[PDB]
CSV table of C-alpha atoms in Angstrom, one decimal:
chain,number,residue,atom,x,y,z
A,811,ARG,CA,108.4,43.5,109.4
A,812,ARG,CA,110.8,46.5,108.5
A,813,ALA,CA,110.6,48.4,105.5
A,814,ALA,CA,113.7,50.2,103.9
A,815,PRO,CA,114.1,53.9,104.9
A,816,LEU,CA,114.0,56.0,101.5
A,817,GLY,CA,117.2,58.2,101.2
A,818,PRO,CA,118.0,60.4,104.2
A,819,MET,CA,117.1,59.6,108.0
A,820,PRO,CA,116.9,63.1,109.6
A,821,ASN,CA,119.7,62.4,112.3
A,822,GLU,CA,121.8,59.6,110.1
A,823,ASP,CA,124.6,62.1,109.4
A,824,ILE,CA,126.1,62.9,112.9
A,825,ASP,CA,128.4,60.2,114.7
A,826,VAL,CA,127.1,59.2,118.2
A,827,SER,CA,130.5,57.7,119.2
A,828,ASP,CA,132.2,60.2,121.6
A,829,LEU,CA,129.4,62.5,122.3
A,830,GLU,CA,131.5,65.1,124.0
A,831,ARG,CA,133.4,66.4,120.8
A,832,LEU,CA,130.3,67.4,119.0
A,833,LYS,CA,129.4,71.1,119.4
A,834,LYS,CA,126.1,71.6,120.9
A,835,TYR,CA,123.2,74.0,120.9
A,836,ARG,CA,123.8,76.2,124.0
A,837,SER,CA,121.1,78.5,123.1
A,838,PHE,CA,117.5,77.6,122.6
A,839,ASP,CA,117.6,80.5,119.6
A,840,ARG,CA,120.2,78.3,117.8
A,841,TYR,CA,117.8,75.4,118.1
A,842,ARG,CA,114.8,77.2,116.9
A,843,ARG,CA,116.7,78.4,113.5
A,844,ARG,CA,118.0,75.1,112.8
A,845,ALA,CA,114.5,73.7,113.3
A,846,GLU,CA,113.0,76.1,111.0
A,847,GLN,CA,115.7,75.4,108.4
A,848,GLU,CA,114.7,71.8,108.4
A,849,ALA,CA,111.1,72.5,108.3
A,850,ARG,CA,111.6,74.3,105.1
A,851,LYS,CA,113.3,71.5,103.0
A,852,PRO,CA,111.1,69.1,101.2
A,853,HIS,CA,111.4,65.7,103.2
A,854,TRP,CA,110.4,62.4,101.9
A,855,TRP,CA,107.7,61.8,104.4
A,856,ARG,CA,104.1,63.0,104.9
A,857,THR,CA,104.7,66.7,106.1
A,858,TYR,CA,102.6,69.8,107.0
A,859,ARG,CA,103.4,71.5,103.9
A,860,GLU,CA,102.1,68.7,101.9
A,861,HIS,CA,98.4,68.6,103.1
A,862,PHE,CA,98.1,72.2,103.7
A,863,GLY,CA,97.7,74.0,100.3
A,864,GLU,CA,101.0,75.6,99.8
A,865,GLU,CA,99.3,77.2,96.6
A,866,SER,CA,100.8,74.5,94.4
A,867,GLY,CA,103.9,74.6,95.8
A,868,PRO,CA,106.6,74.9,92.8
A,869,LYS,CA,105.1,76.9,89.9
A,870,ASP,CA,107.1,77.8,86.6
A,871,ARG,CA,106.5,81.3,86.2
A,872,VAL,CA,105.2,82.9,83.2
A,873,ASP,CA,107.1,86.2,83.4
A,874,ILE,CA,105.9,89.3,81.4
A,875,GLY,CA,108.3,92.0,82.5
A,876,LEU,CA,109.6,95.0,81.6
A,877,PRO,CA,113.2,93.9,81.4
A,878,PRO,CA,115.6,94.1,84.3
A,879,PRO,CA,117.4,97.5,84.7
A,880,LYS,CA,120.8,97.2,83.5
A,881,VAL,CA,123.5,97.8,86.0
A,882,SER,CA,127.4,97.3,86.7
A,883,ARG,CA,128.0,95.7,90.2
A,884,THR,CA,131.6,96.8,90.8
A,885,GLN,CA,130.5,100.3,90.6
A,886,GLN,CA,127.7,100.0,92.9
A,887,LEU,CA,129.8,98.0,95.4
A,888,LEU,CA,132.4,100.5,95.5
A,889,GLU,CA,130.4,103.5,95.7
A,890,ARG,CA,128.5,101.7,98.8
A,891,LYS,CA,131.6,100.7,100.5
A,892,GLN,CA,132.7,104.4,100.3
A,893,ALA,CA,129.5,105.9,101.3
A,894,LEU,CA,129.8,103.2,104.4
A,895,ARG,CA,133.4,104.6,105.1
A,896,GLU,CA,132.1,108.2,104.9
A,897,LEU,CA,129.2,107.6,107.3
A,898,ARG,CA,130.8,105.6,109.9
A,899,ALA,CA,133.9,107.4,110.7
A,900,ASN,CA,131.8,110.5,111.6
A,901,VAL,CA,132.0,111.1,115.3
A,902,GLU,CA,128.4,112.7,115.2
A,903,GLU,CA,126.8,109.4,114.4
A,904,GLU,CA,128.8,107.5,117.0
A,905,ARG,CA,128.1,110.1,119.9
A,906,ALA,CA,124.2,110.1,118.6
A,907,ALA,CA,124.0,106.2,118.3
A,908,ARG,CA,125.7,105.5,121.6
A,909,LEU,CA,123.0,107.7,123.5
A,910,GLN,CA,120.2,106.6,121.6
A,911,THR,CA,119.2,109.6,119.8
A,912,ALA,CA,118.7,109.0,116.0
A,913,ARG,CA,116.0,109.4,113.5
A,914,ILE,CA,115.8,107.8,110.0
A,915,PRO,CA,114.6,110.4,107.2
A,916,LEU,CA,111.6,108.3,106.1
A,917,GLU,CA,111.1,110.2,102.7
A,918,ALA,CA,114.8,109.2,101.6
A,919,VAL,CA,113.9,105.8,102.7
A,920,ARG,CA,110.8,105.9,100.5
A,921,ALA,CA,113.1,107.0,97.6
A,922,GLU,CA,115.5,104.1,98.1
A,923,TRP,CA,112.8,101.8,98.5
A,924,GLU,CA,111.2,103.1,95.1
A,925,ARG,CA,114.6,103.1,93.5
A,926,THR,CA,115.7,99.4,94.2
A,927,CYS,CA,113.9,97.1,96.5
A,928,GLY,CA,110.3,98.3,96.3
A,929,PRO,CA,109.4,96.8,92.8
A,930,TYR,CA,110.3,93.3,94.2
A,931,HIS,CA,107.9,93.8,97.3
A,932,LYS,CA,105.2,94.9,95.0
A,933,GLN,CA,105.4,91.6,93.5
A,934,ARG,CA,104.7,89.8,96.6
A,935,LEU,CA,102.1,92.2,97.8
A,936,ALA,CA,100.2,91.7,94.6
A,937,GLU,CA,100.7,88.2,95.0
A,938,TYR,CA,99.2,88.3,98.5
A,939,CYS,CA,96.1,89.6,97.4
A,940,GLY,CA,96.0,87.6,94.3
A,941,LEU,CA,96.3,90.5,91.7
A,942,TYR,CA,97.8,87.9,89.7
A,943,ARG,CA,95.3,84.8,89.6
A,944,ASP,CA,92.4,86.7,88.7
A,945,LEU,CA,94.2,89.0,86.0
A,946,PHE,CA,96.8,87.5,84.1
A,947,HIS,CA,95.9,84.0,85.2
A,948,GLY,CA,99.2,82.3,85.5
A,949,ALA,CA,101.6,85.3,84.9
A,950,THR,CA,103.9,87.6,87.1
A,951,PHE,CA,104.7,91.1,85.9
A,952,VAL,CA,107.4,92.7,88.1
A,953,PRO,CA,106.3,96.4,88.6
A,954,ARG,CA,109.1,98.1,87.1
A,955,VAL,CA,107.7,101.9,87.1
A,956,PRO,CA,106.5,103.7,90.0
A,957,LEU,CA,102.8,104.6,90.0
A,958,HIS,CA,101.2,107.4,91.9
A,959,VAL,CA,97.5,107.3,92.1
A,960,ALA,CA,95.6,109.8,94.3
A,961,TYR,CA,92.0,110.9,95.1
A,962,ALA,CA,91.2,114.4,96.1
A,963,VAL,CA,89.0,114.6,99.2
A,964,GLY,CA,89.0,118.1,99.6
A,965,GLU,CA,90.7,121.4,98.5
A,966,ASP,CA,93.8,120.7,100.8
A,967,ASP,CA,93.3,116.9,101.1
A,968,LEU,CA,95.0,114.1,99.1
A,969,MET,CA,94.1,110.5,99.7
A,970,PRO,CA,97.0,108.3,98.5
A,971,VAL,CA,96.2,104.8,96.8
A,972,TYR,CA,99.0,102.5,98.2
A,973,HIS,CA,99.0,98.8,97.0
A,974,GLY,CA,97.0,97.0,99.6
A,975,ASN,CA,95.6,100.1,101.6
A,976,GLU,CA,91.9,100.7,102.4
A,977,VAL,CA,90.0,103.4,101.1
A,978,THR,CA,86.3,104.7,101.1
A,979,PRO,CA,83.7,105.0,98.2
A,980,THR,CA,83.2,108.6,99.2
A,981,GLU,CA,86.9,109.5,98.1
A,982,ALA,CA,86.5,107.4,94.9
A,983,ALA,CA,83.4,109.4,94.0
A,984,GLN,CA,85.7,111.7,92.0
A,985,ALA,CA,88.3,111.0,89.3
A,986,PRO,CA,92.1,110.4,90.4
A,987,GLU,CA,95.1,111.8,89.5
A,988,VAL,CA,98.2,109.9,88.5
A,989,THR,CA,102.1,110.5,88.8
A,990,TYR,CA,104.9,108.5,86.7
A,991,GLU,CA,107.7,109.9,84.9
A,992,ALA,CA,108.6,109.4,81.2
A,993,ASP,CA,110.1,111.5,78.4
A,994,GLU,CA,108.4,112.2,75.4
A,995,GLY,CA,108.6,109.5,72.9
A,996,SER,CA,106.2,107.7,75.1
A,997,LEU,CA,103.1,105.8,74.7
A,998,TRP,CA,101.2,104.6,77.5
A,999,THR,CA,97.9,102.7,78.5
A,1000,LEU,CA,96.5,102.7,82.0
A,1001,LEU,CA,93.7,100.6,83.4
A,1002,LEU,CA,91.5,100.5,86.5
A,1003,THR,CA,89.5,97.2,87.3
A,1004,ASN,CA,87.3,96.0,89.9
A,1005,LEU,CA,88.6,92.3,90.5
A,1006,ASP,CA,85.7,91.0,92.2
A,1007,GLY,CA,82.0,92.0,92.8
A,1008,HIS,CA,80.6,90.9,89.2
A,1009,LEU,CA,77.0,90.1,90.2
A,1010,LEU,CA,76.5,87.8,87.1
A,1011,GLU,CA,79.6,86.2,86.1
A,1012,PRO,CA,82.1,85.4,88.9
A,1013,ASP,CA,85.0,85.1,86.5
A,1014,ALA,CA,84.4,88.5,85.1
A,1015,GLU,CA,85.4,92.0,86.5
A,1016,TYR,CA,84.2,95.6,85.8
A,1017,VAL,CA,86.5,98.2,83.9
A,1018,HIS,CA,85.8,101.3,85.9
A,1019,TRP,CA,88.3,103.7,84.3
A,1020,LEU,CA,90.2,102.9,81.1
A,1021,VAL,CA,92.7,105.3,79.3
A,1022,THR,CA,94.6,104.9,76.2
A,1023,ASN,CA,97.6,106.4,73.9
A,1024,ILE,CA,99.3,108.7,76.5
A,1025,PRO,CA,102.7,110.6,75.8
A,1026,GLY,CA,104.7,110.9,78.9
A,1027,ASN,CA,102.9,112.2,82.1
A,1028,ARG,CA,100.0,113.7,80.2
A,1029,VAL,CA,96.7,112.2,81.5
A,1030,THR,CA,94.3,114.8,80.0
A,1031,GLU,CA,95.8,114.3,76.6
A,1032,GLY,CA,95.4,110.4,76.3
A,1033,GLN,CA,92.1,109.4,74.6
A,1034,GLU,CA,89.8,108.0,77.1
A,1035,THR,CA,87.6,105.2,76.6
A,1036,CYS,CA,85.8,104.3,79.7
A,1037,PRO,CA,85.0,107.5,81.7
A,1038,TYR,CA,85.4,107.3,85.3
A,1039,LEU,CA,82.9,105.3,87.4
A,1040,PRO,CA,82.9,105.4,91.2
A,1041,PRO,CA,83.4,102.1,92.9
A,1042,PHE,CA,80.0,100.5,93.6
A,1043,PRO,CA,80.3,97.5,96.1
A,1044,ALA,CA,77.5,95.8,97.8
A,1045,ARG,CA,76.4,96.3,101.2
A,1046,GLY,CA,76.9,93.0,102.1
A,1047,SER,CA,79.8,91.7,100.4
A,1048,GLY,CA,83.1,93.1,102.1
A,1049,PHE,CA,86.3,94.3,100.8
A,1050,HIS,CA,86.7,94.6,96.9
A,1051,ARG,CA,90.0,94.9,95.6
A,1052,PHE,CA,90.7,97.6,92.8
A,1053,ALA,CA,93.7,97.5,90.5
A,1054,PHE,CA,95.6,100.2,88.5
A,1055,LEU,CA,97.6,98.8,85.6
A,1056,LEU,CA,100.1,100.4,83.4
A,1057,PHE,CA,101.2,99.2,79.9
A,1058,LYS,CA,103.9,100.6,77.3
A,1059,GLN,CA,102.8,100.4,73.7
A,1060,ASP,CA,105.3,100.6,70.9
A,1061,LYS,CA,103.0,102.1,68.1
A,1062,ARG,CA,99.8,104.0,68.9
A,1063,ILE,CA,97.3,101.8,69.1
A,1064,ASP,CA,93.5,102.4,68.4
A,1065,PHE,CA,90.9,99.7,69.1
A,1066,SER,CA,87.0,100.0,68.2
A,1067,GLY,CA,85.9,97.1,70.1
A,1068,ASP,CA,86.9,98.4,73.4
A,1069,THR,CA,85.5,101.8,72.7
A,1070,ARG,CA,82.2,102.5,75.1
A,1071,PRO,CA,79.5,105.0,75.0
A,1072,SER,CA,80.2,108.4,76.7
A,1073,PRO,CA,78.0,108.3,79.5
A,1074,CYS,CA,78.0,104.5,79.8
A,1075,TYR,CA,75.9,103.9,82.9
A,1076,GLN,CA,74.8,100.4,81.9
A,1077,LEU,CA,76.5,97.6,83.9
A,1078,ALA,CA,76.6,94.8,81.2
A,1079,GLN,CA,78.3,97.3,79.0
A,1080,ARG,CA,81.4,97.1,81.2
A,1081,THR,CA,82.3,93.4,81.5
A,1082,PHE,CA,86.0,92.4,81.2
A,1083,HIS,CA,88.8,89.9,81.3
A,1084,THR,CA,92.2,91.4,81.4
A,1085,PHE,CA,93.2,87.9,79.8
A,1086,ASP,CA,91.3,88.5,76.6
A,1087,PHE,CA,92.5,92.3,76.6
A,1088,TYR,CA,96.0,91.5,76.7
A,1089,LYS,CA,95.6,88.6,74.1
A,1090,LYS,CA,94.2,91.2,71.8
A,1091,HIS,CA,97.1,93.9,72.2
A,1092,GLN,CA,99.8,91.4,73.5
A,1093,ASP,CA,102.6,92.1,70.9
A,1094,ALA,CA,102.3,95.9,71.4
A,1095,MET,CA,101.6,95.8,75.1
A,1096,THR,CA,103.8,95.3,78.2
A,1097,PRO,CA,102.7,95.6,81.7
A,1098,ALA,CA,104.4,98.1,83.8
A,1099,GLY,CA,103.1,99.5,87.0
A,1100,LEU,CA,100.9,98.3,89.6
A,1101,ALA,CA,98.8,100.0,92.3
A,1102,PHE,CA,95.7,98.5,94.4
A,1103,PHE,CA,93.3,99.5,97.1
A,1104,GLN,CA,90.6,97.6,99.0
A,1105,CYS,CA,87.2,99.1,99.6
A,1106,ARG,CA,84.0,98.1,101.5
A,1107,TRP,CA,80.3,99.2,101.3
A,1108,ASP,CA,79.7,103.2,102.3
A,1109,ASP,CA,77.0,105.4,102.5
A,1110,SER,CA,77.5,107.1,99.1
A,1111,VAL,CA,76.9,103.8,97.4
A,1112,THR,CA,73.1,104.0,97.6
A,1113,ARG,CA,73.0,107.4,95.7
A,1114,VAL,CA,74.8,105.4,92.7
A,1115,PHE,CA,72.7,102.4,92.2
A,1116,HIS,CA,69.3,104.5,92.2
A,1117,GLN,CA,70.4,107.7,90.1
A,1118,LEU,CA,73.2,106.1,87.6
A,1119,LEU,CA,72.1,102.5,87.1
A,1120,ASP,CA,68.2,102.7,87.9
A,1121,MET,CA,68.5,99.7,89.8
A,1122,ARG,CA,67.6,98.5,93.1
A,1123,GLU,CA,70.5,98.1,95.7
A,1124,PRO,CA,71.5,94.6,96.4
A,1125,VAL,CA,72.2,93.6,100.1
A,1126,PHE,CA,74.2,90.5,100.9
A,1127,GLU,CA,74.8,88.5,104.3
A,1128,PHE,CA,76.9,85.9,105.7
A,1129,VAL,CA,75.4,82.3,106.0
A,1130,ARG,CA,77.3,79.5,108.1
A,1131,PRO,CA,76.1,75.9,107.2
A,1132,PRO,CA,73.6,74.7,110.1
A,1133,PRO,CA,75.3,72.8,112.9
A,1134,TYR,CA,75.6,69.1,112.0
A,1135,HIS,CA,73.4,66.6,114.3
A,1136,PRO,CA,73.8,62.8,114.3
A,1137,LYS,CA,70.7,60.9,113.1
A,1138,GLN,CA,68.2,61.0,115.6
A,1139,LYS,CA,67.6,57.5,117.8
A,1140,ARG,CA,64.4,56.2,118.8
A,1141,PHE,CA,65.6,55.8,122.4
A,1142,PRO,CA,68.4,58.2,122.6
A,1143,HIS,CA,70.2,56.8,125.6
A,1144,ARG,CA,72.0,58.6,128.3
A,1145,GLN,CA,71.4,62.0,126.8
A,1146,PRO,CA,70.3,65.2,128.5
A,1147,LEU,CA,66.5,66.3,128.3
A,1148,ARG,CA,67.4,69.0,125.8
A,1149,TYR,CA,68.3,66.4,123.5
A,1150,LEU,CA,64.9,66.5,122.3
A,1151,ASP,CA,65.1,70.1,121.4
A,1152,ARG,CA,68.0,69.6,118.7
A,1153,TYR,CA,65.7,67.9,116.1
A,1154,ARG,CA,63.0,70.2,116.8
A,1155,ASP,CA,61.5,71.6,113.5
A,1156,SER,CA,60.1,74.9,114.5
A,1157,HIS,CA,59.0,76.3,118.1
A,1158,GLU,CA,55.4,76.3,118.7
A,1159,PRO,CA,53.2,73.6,120.0
A,1160,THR,CA,51.0,71.8,117.5
A,1161,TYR,CA,48.0,70.1,118.8
A,1162,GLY,CA,47.5,67.8,116.0
A,1163,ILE,CA,43.7,66.8,116.2
A,1164,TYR,CA,43.0,68.9,119.0
B,624,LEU,CA,57.9,108.6,105.0
B,625,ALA,CA,57.7,112.0,103.8
B,626,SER,CA,53.8,111.3,102.8
B,627,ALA,CA,53.1,110.2,106.4
B,628,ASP,CA,51.4,112.8,108.3
B,629,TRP,CA,50.8,110.8,111.5
B,630,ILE,CA,54.5,111.3,112.4
B,631,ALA,CA,55.9,114.8,113.2
B,632,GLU,CA,58.5,116.5,110.8
B,633,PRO,CA,61.3,116.0,113.2
B,634,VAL,CA,60.2,112.2,113.5
B,635,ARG,CA,59.8,112.0,110.0
B,636,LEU,CA,63.4,113.4,109.3
B,637,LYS,CA,65.2,111.4,112.0
B,638,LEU,CA,63.4,108.0,111.2
B,639,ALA,CA,64.9,108.4,107.7
B,640,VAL,CA,68.4,108.9,109.1
B,641,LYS,CA,69.0,106.1,111.7
B,642,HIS,CA,67.1,103.6,109.6
B,643,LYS,CA,68.3,104.6,106.1
B,644,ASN,CA,69.2,100.9,105.5
B,645,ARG,CA,65.7,99.6,105.4
B,646,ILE,CA,64.4,102.6,103.2
B,647,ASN,CA,63.5,101.9,99.7
B,648,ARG,CA,64.0,104.4,96.6
B,649,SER,CA,60.3,104.6,96.5
B,650,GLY,CA,60.7,106.4,99.9
B,651,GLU,CA,59.1,103.3,101.6
B,652,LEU,CA,60.2,102.2,105.1
B,653,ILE,CA,60.2,98.5,105.2
B,654,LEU,CA,59.7,96.3,108.4
B,655,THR,CA,60.2,92.5,108.3
B,656,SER,CA,58.8,89.9,110.8
B,657,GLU,CA,59.5,86.1,110.6
B,658,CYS,CA,59.4,83.9,114.1
B,659,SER,CA,55.7,83.0,114.6
B,660,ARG,CA,54.1,81.0,112.1
B,661,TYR,CA,50.7,82.6,113.0
B,662,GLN,CA,50.9,86.1,111.2
B,663,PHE,CA,49.0,87.7,114.0
B,664,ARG,CA,52.2,87.7,116.2
B,665,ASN,CA,54.3,88.8,113.0
B,666,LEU,CA,52.1,91.8,112.7
B,667,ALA,CA,52.4,92.6,116.4
B,668,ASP,CA,56.3,92.4,115.9
B,669,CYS,CA,56.5,94.7,113.0
B,670,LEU,CA,54.0,97.1,114.6
B,671,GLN,CA,56.3,97.0,118.0
B,672,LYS,CA,59.5,97.6,116.2
B,673,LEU,CA,57.9,100.6,114.5
B,674,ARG,CA,56.6,101.8,117.8
B,675,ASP,CA,60.2,101.6,119.3
B,676,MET,CA,61.9,103.4,116.2
B,677,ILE,CA,59.1,106.2,116.7
B,678,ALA,CA,59.8,106.1,120.6
B,679,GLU,CA,63.5,106.1,120.1
B,680,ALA,CA,63.4,108.8,117.6
B,681,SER,CA,60.8,111.1,119.4
B,682,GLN,CA,62.7,110.9,122.5
B,683,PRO,CA,65.1,113.8,122.3
B,684,UNK,CA,67.5,112.8,125.2
B,685,UNK,CA,68.9,109.6,123.4
B,686,UNK,CA,72.6,109.7,123.5
B,687,UNK,CA,73.1,106.7,121.2
B,688,UNK,CA,75.6,105.2,123.4
B,689,UNK,CA,78.7,103.5,121.2
B,690,UNK,CA,80.0,100.1,122.5
B,691,UNK,CA,84.0,100.2,122.0
B,692,UNK,CA,83.9,96.2,121.8
B,693,UNK,CA,82.3,95.8,118.1
B,694,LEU,CA,83.7,99.2,116.9
B,695,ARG,CA,87.3,99.3,118.2
B,696,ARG,CA,88.8,97.6,115.0
B,697,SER,CA,86.7,100.3,113.2
B,698,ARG,CA,88.2,103.2,115.2
B,699,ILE,CA,91.7,101.9,114.8
B,700,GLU,CA,91.2,101.2,111.0
B,701,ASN,CA,89.6,104.7,110.6
B,702,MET,CA,92.5,106.4,112.4
B,703,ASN,CA,95.0,104.3,110.4
B,704,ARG,CA,93.4,105.5,107.1
B,705,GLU,CA,93.1,108.9,108.2
B,706,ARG,CA,97.1,109.1,108.7
B,707,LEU,CA,97.0,108.3,105.1
B,708,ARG,CA,94.3,110.9,104.1
B,709,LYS,CA,96.5,113.3,106.2
B,710,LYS,CA,98.8,114.1,103.4
B,711,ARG,CA,98.5,117.6,102.5
B,712,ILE,CA,99.0,118.9,99.1
B,713,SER,CA,96.6,120.8,96.8
B,714,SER,CA,95.2,118.5,94.0
B,715,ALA,CA,93.1,118.6,90.9
């Protein structure tokens, strides 16, 4: 009994008559490439991608962006062609390249990455650590504006916060400084959220440091709502992630519901959903910059919980489910002696009536 | 720990350093025992751990030997976050 193949059968297209006149894969590498090309297409039969959780596969993106920067392409193409002409025709670069001596100027690369491609890498790096799922819940914002967050670890020492980097609570015991560039017509709102580590409510976060109504680059001049609170992870649970967000606002907005007491040590006072917050201010607020850092328990934390929050410090561990044993049988057949010890309740003799 | 006289001051202060994980906000050093179901042996285990912490602290010649097997990734990640911290500009 044969069924009818549904649509394309993988090799159907090639003509087996006269095999000598078909080109071949002479290279193992070519084969490799064509193979992966095939592995990426959506076949009509049960496949690896299907059962292994492709993260929903196709998703129709809710894009809340800052609109794509307007550029004429012919200008770019020409200027680039010319830059290439100038760069290649130089005998210095040829002599240097042949002898394996050259260096690429990392700072300028950082500048170009920032200017063009970087804002796209940001998107998928945020996607990686899931800065989207927990905050905007369906929605992707492309990080248009460059965001530099930094903690001062000494008089001369600056700790950078890059998206995805690991930082210690010690350096986060102090307030950060921020760099981004805007003229003054500007109106900004900046946010620092702890995306996991909420003890009572798994779907809720902790606003650490919230700032509102900022002209240009002036951070001191923006009205602050939540004064700065150093990250307070738990000893057990590893590697929380912290998100720095930027929003443009059109008219200066003031919101009393969001306002918090000045010292504000209590934890239930800080309970947050980026979702609801952005629902409240949605029309006037457009998401802009993104920078996040990953942090795990460190010595300074004990000082926090006791001194600030007047609370005992929680310690968590890792529990792996007890190894599965089949039902014990009255006469285990053909089993080692130690079989008896798999169903052992506890290790201690028990003399029952004795 | 601060109130216990039966331990000398150097012992007091160094048992408060290595063990700071089991110290309590009331200044309490907390020991836990489980295995036996006869509380006698549990007491013996706690008193033994206590004698071992006091012994290891009281012996000044202990070099606290570091294993590179569990801490290699820690040293690598530490160096790597050190290369980012290494940026030198006066801030604040």
